[PDB]
Ligand binder design. Sequence first.
Ligand code: BUK
Length: 233
Amino acid sequence: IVGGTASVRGEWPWQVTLHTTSPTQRHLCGGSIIGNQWILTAAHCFYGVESPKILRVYSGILNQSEIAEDTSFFGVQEIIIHDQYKMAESGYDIALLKLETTVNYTDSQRPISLPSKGDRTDCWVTGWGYRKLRDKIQNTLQKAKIPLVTNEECQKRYRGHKITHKMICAGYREGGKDACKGDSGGPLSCKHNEVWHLVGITSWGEGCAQRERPGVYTNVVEYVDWILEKTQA
Ligand SMILES: *[C@@](O)(C1NC=CS1)[C@H](CCCNC(=N)N)NC(=O)[C@@H](NC(=O)[C@H](CC(N)=O)NC(=O)N[C@H](C)c1ccc(Br)cc1)C(C)C
């Protein structure tokens, strides 16, 4: 997260930190709780990830230093990637994680409502990623208010990339506030009528918070059907 501020403990209940044990443990990507045993995130986060067994999910986290070898975590029973995914920059950068055990909701971990298809503004991108292109994972969960930018507006900034309707861009004309390396998979949460909705999944972008370079996110509303299909028994 570039140009943001440290969050408060429990400020973003759905946000979780995904770790990989190979070759050694470390933050891998962001993620959103959306059900007892369902974590939503970006598909590109599992490039070269063979077994779901190397994945460890931590919810209710504020600071990475809350995580040590003796720290509890939810095991990942299954990794479901969208059958059309290929490159994050081509779309379908969405994936589901089915946790080994059910999640007990508390003040520090609750799910986030999926946007209503009937809805095809007050948005924030959160994460523990870089503060600038070259940097390091942040200990304290970062957050930043970013305005959504139309696709026609996005396409222009990306004359080399084709921004479909399954994508949505957010950023500032001037930059300065955007997600960066390590925020991937993480949520773009927007609040309407004081109800949060998972509008986007951090996906890609040229650099971080650069002028006229909106961050490209997966447009979640375009996948709820896919989601209900995968979450179903
Ligand atoms: C995620 O946090 C990560 N996914 C995997 C590792 S880190 C970032 C979020 C990017 C948000 N950007 C923004 N709002 N400005 N995603 C990526 O790094 C993805 N790639 C890219 O965003 C860009 C796309 C491009 N056309 O350049 N690629 C890129 O930065 N590539 C270089 C090679 C790179 C440098 C450092 C790191 Br840690 C990764 C890649 C994924 C790689 C698809």
